[PDB]
Swiss-Prot record, chains A, B:
Residues given in the record as 2-oxoglutarate binding sites: Y131, T182, N191, K200, N280
Name the record gives this protein: Hypoxia-inducible factor 1-alpha inhibitor
Effect of substituting I330R: No effect on dimer formation and HIF1A Asn hydroxylation activity
Residues bound to substrate: D138, Q167, L168, T169, D187, E188, Q189, R224, Q225, A286, N307
Interaction with VHL as annotated region, ranges: 1-111
EC number from the UniProt entry: 1.14.11.30, 1.14.11.n4
Assembly, per entry: Homodimer; homodimerization is essential for catalytic activity. Interacts with VHL and HIF1A. Part of a complex with VHL, HIF1A and HDAC1 or HDAC2 or HDAC3. Interacts with NFKB1 and NFKBIA. Interacts with NOTCH1, NOTCH2 and NOTCH3 but not with NOTCH4. Interacts with APBA3; binding inhibits HIF1AN binding to HIF1A. Interacts with TNKS2. Interacts with PPP1R12A. Interacts with ASB4. Interacts with UBE3A. Interacts with ANKS3. Interacts with NECAB3; the interaction is indirect and seems to be mediated by APBA3.
Compartmental location: Nucleus; Cytoplasm; Cytoplasm, Perinuclear region
Effect of H185A: Prevents suppression of HIF CAD activity. Strongly stimulates 2-oxoglutarate turnover. No stimulation of 2-oxoglutarate turnover
Cystine pairings recorded for this chain: none
Annotated region (Disordered), positions in chain: 1-37
């Protein structure tokens, strides 16, 4: 259920702001960073929402006015879409599938241009949607650097150490419009997902639900995304989607969501909730141990499947032949 | 059609001695070793029957009386079966499938015992069937060694050289009863199949008909055999068997059939034709070239499929999990 804001300011959000879907869910635990149950969840690679990390405390004052003034004159990737679904695709793989036309057009622009185009849309009541997704880098201004340095690196660096993770790969600045949806997908990195402004509903699925979520081929641009349209699921093509069960939560300013590697996540900015701001923290997973302990984890089997698809594409000399060979291998033999 | 014996002795065989099957065939060419068309077939890894190699000329005098006297007192593997089908299975893999019970019982015995048990069956008109399949080795007697040395090693060694093949892996002595059938299977070696006594009908299928012949899993004891019962094909499980087309021939004394590596072959001793004797010559294929030339050959794709199945069994730690993972990989993704 919804949490209540301090000072009797009422519920920060209500259930009417959540999109409706076909599957059940149960809540992700919301715990204190000091709660040993939280440490045991992270250690066991299960999601948890940490409510008191102060991980991005200096950034909670961030809004568009503050950011436009201080974030500098770097280039910012901005994605557009006529729909509320922003497809998570890979431009590098778009050669393999010359018949895929993305619905999200990316445009590189300056931050003040992003704010203006967002203003124009609001002014003219248009229905276009935007989502800024830019990797924080050196070009940012001095006041943003100060805020960045003020993150709780003591806490997150200890986590990185305790879990044997690799190095911090990148920090994404995410600014979206209300109602924006990032479709279900999984990442090959560990993620601390730090909510700054507004509210995002996060629906996670464990890696062992690979069978119910039907990812695109590895060589397809939408690799690691679910093929299932959550708003109109085609149960004839994706029958096991009727067996999916999610882990759900709404994160607001100050919350940090641990999204374990290989865990599917569907992320939506709440309807009529205003703009949302998030910074995430991606870390390479711990290295694979020398002695493999059976039985394998679900995510290890996903890695095996990915590697098979990759090698088959290399050996055949064409990713388009992967599908035909795999069917040849199974039809009448393993089915 | 049937060939005619020299001296007006009539047709060596007639069509009534061939079992009836559901698929069409076209004949394998029967050519002289000196015919350049024969060399081009072998070079292109296509089957050909060579009629004048004299490859096993000294062995054409062989019969059970001569062999029992001179072949020595070694052990000979003899397979039995209540049916005319002798299943080509692997005892080493029988651990993976503890629910597979072979129909062919192997018994190790001396050659005179093989002849006697064959005599008893004939005497009592029983319906049991036998097939002797023993790798020629050192234990053979002096007169058989003399015959072996008298093979045409000049010709076959030149073939081995011209084709870049590896070394001769083994020579099998095959003695079967009329009507015996070795079900369709492929071998991972090059084979010169030298017919000595009696007549065998050989039905070959190219490697690109993998889809129509449904081999067992690689880890199954009957690896490399077709799952399809040629006498009663289950078209519901094996629908593409209705598209199979074979290459057919009957080899008699003096003929040599080149069975190229990875080519399926179904081999049957002719009905009411008496006992059959064959010696085959297995060679390791030429090494895979350093620069792979695309498009791949059909047999290279078969090798890829075999390797995928093998690696999946090793990685998962159990060959029984191969099937489930492959289905998970394809369902709703590549089909
Ligand atoms: C939707 C978008 C802007 C996008 C478009 C095109 C290519 C890639 C991406 C991409 C990658 C990550 C995110 C952040 C977050 C989802 C969220 O919060 O919306 C998430 O999935 C994660 O932290 O792992 C968002 C995006
Ligand atoms: C049927 C039999 C006796 C068998 C039983 C159990 C395990 C293995 C084998 C095996 C292997 C080879 C052959 C010879 C030939 C077929 C033929 O002429 O009958 C052939 O397939 C080939 O030369 O490649 C025959 C057999
Ligand atoms: Zn993600
Ligand atoms: Zn064979």
């Amino acid at each position: 259920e919804p949490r209540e804001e301090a000072g009797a300011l009422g519920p920060a959000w209500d259930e009417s702001q959540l999109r409706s879907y076909s599957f059940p869910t149960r809540p992700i635990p919301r715990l204190s960073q000091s709660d040993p149950r939280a440490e045991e969840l992270i250690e066991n690679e299960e999601p948890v929402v940490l409510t008191d990390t102060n991980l991005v405390y200096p950034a909670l004052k961030w809004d568009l006015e503050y950011l436009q003034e201080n974030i500098g004159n770097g280039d910012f990737s901005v994605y557009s879409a006529s729909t509320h679904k922003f497809l998570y695709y890979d431009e590098k793989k778009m050669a393999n599938f010359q018949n895929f036309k993305p619905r999200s057009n990316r445009e590189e622009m300056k931050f003040h241009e992003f704010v203006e185009k967002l203003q124009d849309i609001q002014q003219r009541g248009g229905e276009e949607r935007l989502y800024l997704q830019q990797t924080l880098n050196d070009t940012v201004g001095r006041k943003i650097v100060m805020d960045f340095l003020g993150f709780n690196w003591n806490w997150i660096n200890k986590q990185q150490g305790k879990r044997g993770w690799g190095q911090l790969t990148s920090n994404l600045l995410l600014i979206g419009m209300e109602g924006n949806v990032t479709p279900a997908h999984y990442d090959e990195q560990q993620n601390f997902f730090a909510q700054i402004k507004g509210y995002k509903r996060c629906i996670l699925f464990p890696p062992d639900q690979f069978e119910c979520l039907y990812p695109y081929p590895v060589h397809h641009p939408c690799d690691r995304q679910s093929q299932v349209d959550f708003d109109n699921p085609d149960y004839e093509r994706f029958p096991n989607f009727q067996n999916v069960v999610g882990y759900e939560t709404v994160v607001g300013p100050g919350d940090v969501l641990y999204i374990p590697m290989y865990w599917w996540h569907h992320i939506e900015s709440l309807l009529n909730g205003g703009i949302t701001i998030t910074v995430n923290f991606w870390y390479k997973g711990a290295p694979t141990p020398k002695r493999i302990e059976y039985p394998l984890k679900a995510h290890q089997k996903v890695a095996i499947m990915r590697n098979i698809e990759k090698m088959l594409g290399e050996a055949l000399g064409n990713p388009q032949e992967v599908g035909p060979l795999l069917n040849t291998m199974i039809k009448g033999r393993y089915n």
